């Protein structure tokens, strides 16, 4: 199982630094040039630079927009690859992805990026760090509509599950909103009125900028 | 190399046929393989991309009939010979003949019958009035299209700031909306009034569908 998992998002200060690692498993490291791409929120996809298989020399290569900003190296003992950012501003305030490359030098070769990171979220602002407020939604028939309501956070991004991922079907999650310098979201979940309350449902609200996980038990008025 | 992508969005049908374009500034045919270098992805709101076409024409593991590459040298084309439900997504184009670049994308939306919303409306919760704030969310569920309107009232008056509006992605398996109309006041702001009334306006009636509550209750 090919395995690309990034680390080190989160919020940065302009003007500074930071560097993102991609610890791989699944494959041969060494046979796969390795490439990053980033996206703005809302934005295209854009590639940012590649480093060569052992066979080429494990040489760098990188866009113009990020030329002698960004660097890329890997430990091919550890079979991780880094991304190093300098100098950082707003603008590069986006989700962060590895994918693994060409392998044109042993075994099956076609030129596409065949397996992709979940990707890390960077955002490059002078602000404060800080964990979301998580409030219930319940209301003041066959099936009853419940929430939570997501607010006060930043940087980007909250995730919300429910009851730790079994509850899936029937939820919609709004996209966020920025006032006032915080993010706000609201999620909500639709089941049968003969589950709850009579069972237990539980919205899981994660902020990972923070390394934050809220629980808010729905509970009726 | 240049990739630019046509168009920046459309919306289609279930069941329809949709082409999309891609353009580079440089051939990608390589002389040395005789192929395109060029890959063509889908990435779904909240997920990665992932490969469907590669060497302009060849189609990835696991990705159905329904998706076809085509082009050679400068022009290139997806197209998908039925759209579904799941394909609500941008695609992407990547030449790689020379370094990489990804075209701008192509956002796929879905056309779909009219549908009615279904409103609820939520008072604030305990623990948020203790810390003194007020949240209130009116919740427009399952509706099309996309644009709709809120109105909020306070005790019969129309109430238009501190109103926050957001929207869902188009839902992956019935192609709705829903949306989140949120009047946030201080706790005493709050304690001030009794009634609260949202009505959505929506092209699925000429009368506003109204949801209220009183805080006495
Ligand atoms: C074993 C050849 C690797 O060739 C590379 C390379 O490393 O530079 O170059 C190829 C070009 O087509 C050569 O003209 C492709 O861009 C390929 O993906 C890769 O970037
Ligand atoms: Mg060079």
């Known amino acids: 199982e090919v395995m690309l998992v990034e680390s080190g998002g989160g919020l940065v200060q302009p003007g500074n630094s930071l560097r993102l690692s991609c610890a791989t498993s699944?494959?041969?490291?060494?046979?796969?040039?390795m490439s990053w791409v980033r996206q703005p929120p809302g934005k295209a996809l854009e590639w940012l630079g590649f480093?060569?298989?052992?066979?080429?020399?494990?040489?760098?290569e990188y866009s113009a927009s990020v030329k002698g900003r960004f660097t890329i190296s890997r430990d091919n003992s550890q079979s991780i690859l880094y991304l190093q950012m300098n100098t950082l501003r707003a603008e590069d305030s986006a989700t962060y992805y590895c994918?693994?490359?060409?392998?044109?030098?042993?075994?099956?070769?076609?030129?596409?990026?065949?397996?992709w990171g979940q990707g890390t979220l960077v955002t490059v602002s002078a602000a404060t760090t800080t964990a979301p407020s998580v409030y219930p939604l319940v209301p003041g028939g066959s099936s009853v509509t419940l929430g939570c309501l997501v607010k006060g956070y930043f940087p980007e991004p909250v995730t919300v599950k429910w009851n730790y991922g079994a509850l899936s079907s029937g939820v919609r999650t709004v996209s966020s909103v920025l006032q006032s310098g915080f993010y706000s979201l609201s999620s909500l979940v639709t089941v049968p009125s003969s589950t709850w309350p009579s069972q237990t449902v539980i919205c899981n609200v994660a902020h990972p900028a923070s390394k934050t996980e809220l629980i808010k038990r729905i509970e009726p008025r | 190399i240049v990739m630019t992508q046509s168009p920046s969005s459309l919306a289609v049908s279930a069941g329809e046929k949709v082409t999309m374009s891609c353009k580079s500034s440089?051939?990608?045919?390589?002389?040395?393989?005789?192929?395109?270098?060029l890959a063509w992805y889908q990435q779904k709101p909240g997920q990665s991309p992932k490969l469907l076409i590669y060497w302009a024409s060849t189609r990835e593991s696991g990705v159905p009939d329904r998706f076809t590459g085509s082009g050679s040298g400068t022009d290139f084309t997806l197209t998908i010979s039925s759209v579904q439900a799941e394909d609500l997504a941008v695609y992407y184009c990547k030449q790689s003949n020379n370094l990489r670049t990804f075209g701008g994308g192509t956002k796929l939306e879905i056309k779909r019958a009219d549908a009615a919303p279904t409103v609820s409306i939520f008072p604030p919760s305990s623990e948020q009035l203790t810390s003194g704030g007020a949240s209130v969310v009116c919740f427009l569920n399952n509706f099309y299209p996309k644009d709709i309107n809120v109105k909020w009232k306070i005790d019969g008056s129309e109430r238009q700031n501190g109103v926050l509006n957001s929207w869902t992605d188009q839902d992956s398996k019935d192609s709705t909306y829903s949306m989140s109309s949120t009047l946030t006041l201080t706790k005493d702001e709050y304690e001030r009034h009794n009634s609260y009334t949202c009505e959505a306006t929506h092209k699925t009636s000429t009368s506003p569908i109204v949801k209220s509550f009183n805080r006495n209750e």
């Open positions: 480093i060569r298989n052992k066979a080429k020399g494990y040489t760098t």
């Open positions: 994918a693994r490359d060409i392998s044109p030098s042993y075994g099956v070769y076609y030129e596409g990026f065949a397996y």
């Open positions: 440089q051939s990608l045919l390589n002389s040395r393989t005789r192929k395109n270098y």
């Open positions: 699944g494959f041969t490291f060494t046979d796969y040039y």
